[PDB]
From a paper:
The model of NpaA1 built by Alphafold2 was used as the template for a molecular replacement for apo-NpaA1. The crystal structure of apo-NpaA1 revealed that there are six monomers arranged as a hexamer in an asymmetric unit. In apo NpaA1, there are two Mn2+ ions binding to the active center, coordinated by glutamic acid and histidine residues.
Author numbering:
A (entry chain D): 6 to 87, 96 to 495
B (entry chain F): 6 to 417, 423 to 495
The structure:
Amino acid sequence: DFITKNNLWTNEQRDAADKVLAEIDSLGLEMIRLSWADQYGLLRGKSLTVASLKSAFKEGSEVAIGPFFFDLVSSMVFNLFTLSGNPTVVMVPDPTTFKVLPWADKTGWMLADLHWKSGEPFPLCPRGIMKKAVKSLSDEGYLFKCGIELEWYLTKIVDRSLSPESLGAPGVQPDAIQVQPVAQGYSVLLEHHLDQVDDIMSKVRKGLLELNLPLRSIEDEWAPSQMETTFDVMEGLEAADAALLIKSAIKQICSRHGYHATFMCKPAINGFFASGWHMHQSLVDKDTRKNLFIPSEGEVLSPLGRAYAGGLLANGSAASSFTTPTVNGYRRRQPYSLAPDRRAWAKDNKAAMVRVVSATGDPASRIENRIGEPGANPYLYMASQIVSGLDGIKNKKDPGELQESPYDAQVPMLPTTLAEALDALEHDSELFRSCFGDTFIKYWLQLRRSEWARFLDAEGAEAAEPTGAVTQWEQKEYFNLL
Amino acid sequence: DFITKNNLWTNEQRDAADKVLAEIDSLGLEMIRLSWADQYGLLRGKSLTVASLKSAFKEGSEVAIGPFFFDLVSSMVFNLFTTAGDFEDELSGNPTVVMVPDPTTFKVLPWADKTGWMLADLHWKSGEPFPLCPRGIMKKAVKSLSDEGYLFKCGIELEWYLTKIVDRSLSPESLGAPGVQPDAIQVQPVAQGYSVLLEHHLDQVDDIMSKVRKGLLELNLPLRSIEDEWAPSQMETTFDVMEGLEAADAALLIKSAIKQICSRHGYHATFMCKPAINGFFASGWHMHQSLVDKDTRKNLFIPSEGEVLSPLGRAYAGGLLANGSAASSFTTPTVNGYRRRQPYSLAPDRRAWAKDNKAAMVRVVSATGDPASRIENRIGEPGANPYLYMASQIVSGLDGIKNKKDPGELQEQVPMLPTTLAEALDALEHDSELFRSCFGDTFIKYWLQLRRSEWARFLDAEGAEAAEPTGAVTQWEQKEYFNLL
Ligand SMILES: [Mn+2]
Ligand SMILES: [Mn+2]
Ligand SMILES: [Mn+2]
């Protein structure tokens, strides 16, 4: 009993486990998927039978850490045969995360944590970085509350790009899935585009509901075939696990019915505008459970929330590779685009990095950080916000002055390439090295700089210009998987 | 509770929400749409979960005002990125407003999967109503009307085209860009025409037409008639009399149901006045109107012998007429709506009153002592915004009442109506006081600002000559109104 010997379950998780086996038995489930988010947010793991799950509930399941050392295309940034080699770690199931996948045949699903065989936590496990952030927020008196609002694209699959000629090779991107848009229209919020796409959208809507996910709204975003699904507030690690499931389920559900959902920021398809992942955040007293961001008369935020906003602004440059992991996501670093090109904050202004949604006495007063990207890793994005903010609280960082025109603000600019965001983390190594782990940032810096290098040798430096056209390297790196 | 705090709900609005939630539960709905009419009459909004709509019945639901500052093809008319000091004097920014659900508008949409629908009113977070909300501008007319003792009784005669879809123009090179017109949906007529009212045309199109009829009927919309119009594939669908806000709400839902149902079975319904398709003539939205006494429920237009209308109805007609050029951009908001002059037809392009003459803007239907004595405005285009069309008639007609404006002798030197949306805006600019007073002064300057840009876009596309109303429908007009209106 690996799990019991190393004290990896709480009584809650233990009784959870007892019940997940009871649900498996009455539901007649034949497979149970066991997954974890890699460095990119992509769900990797194994599909177990129900005899093996019951054994994994004592021993765990062995997996190699090779995904962590590969890129999206499988090039070896780190040597796997010798930050090196391919040790084999234990997948430790978290029974509290179980869900009965409704688009699959008799298949359950539940997330896994990564552990060395000694029992200590694997230091690259992105979920572990969110646990670390949530634990430190619980030691300062706060619970992290997140409203998930996801902008993504919806397309019908023309060709799945399966011919041997299209398969690529480790380091050689495969062809993008061939798609076509489902609706046109730069008319935003049009009910007619909703009813047009609801043939497929009603299947995604029904799937989110069956997962007992707290779906809030389904909206026609601005661009042709661009969509917005928002969710009610969730708390802490739970919200990250839920973003994860939300993006996986949308993609899997669409594909079963012959559609392609992508969270790639800006697909290389004419008429497609950049997608954003704005992150609605507030803090709540771990005891009192009341928004500690609520302002008074004259305030747009409580002093606490003001401090949170300061560290969100202060650290957002080092944090950019986390809020915007992808190359392609930096075409959002632009003026006059409803996206943030500089560290500005404002009450009700979409051209800002931090947007305040608040009112005097309003228990829903909160911050909207808009430097986020839809394809971000939900554990690195949200822990970014937890680490960034709690720094502002701790160091009483004034956010400065609410900006009436963020695109004229003389505030510090945000990075405009993924190279720049990596540079900014190198020269502000601390805080993220104290919180994410020194080993992680060394790893993170080395791996992501390798992918920048591949974009550069494929497209050149002048293609990196954010206003530029979306390159084919972006399409054949992010469209299929993200 | 946002809605109790600013008392945005009467008790009836509260006796409804309780049963709105009750049949949501009874029927097992999973989505409720919350929609609102933008400057164009086009239904914007969100689709909310049950759990989430239960919240909006207390706190509302937020939404940006971008549609109001965007064109049909989403050019940015007003700077969206600079927050405003007095928004109503600079018109800049993307403020978040609250959508206040109105339960008296609840419907289960027949053609959709387990999905409900209601209308929302746009309010500032301050609790005070947003100054451009067209449904608010209708709410205002109905008030000033009830504050003079009258209810608005409205009869709708709505013409439109029903066509089969050949291509939805979804290829990426068709999608357009912000400010760029997307390609028009490719279509095919469904019947031949130039054989007006032909029963066999009706039976010919009833495969989908019955699906529209049935959908309108399930919505409890008071459908009066379906008729076969003159031009190929042109229909007219008329409705029984409706009152005040309900008639404009229904007008909106009428067009919404008609387009959504047709598209769901692969047809394209369009309220474009005159599509750029061979043989298609101009479609109209005629509005019969009368005033009733708000306490006796009785038609105040009914004429005695000697006069064609009562002196109340006669005054209204004068207010309909003396502001008709000003109001033109609210009864005929599209460039396309002015193409109405053709070699085989008569357009109501005269600002005049008549019983038989088809060129007069208003037709009178009145026999002595007849309880259905009324007037009929005919400059209405079908792709018109219902709130602003109806409120333009109440506002025009109340002027004539309060000022005893004389319409003059029935015309079978006739003053003419604006021939273009440019001229229509010229007319409103130079005679703005009554609309600035009753529609809001910020709305009128926002309206003239928005549409004058829509005209320069059209002019920049096809040139001054093709802008002439007599001329053929250009490609700018097709790619501006065909798909959305
Ligand atoms: Mn959005
Ligand atoms: Mn007719
Ligand atoms: Mn008529």
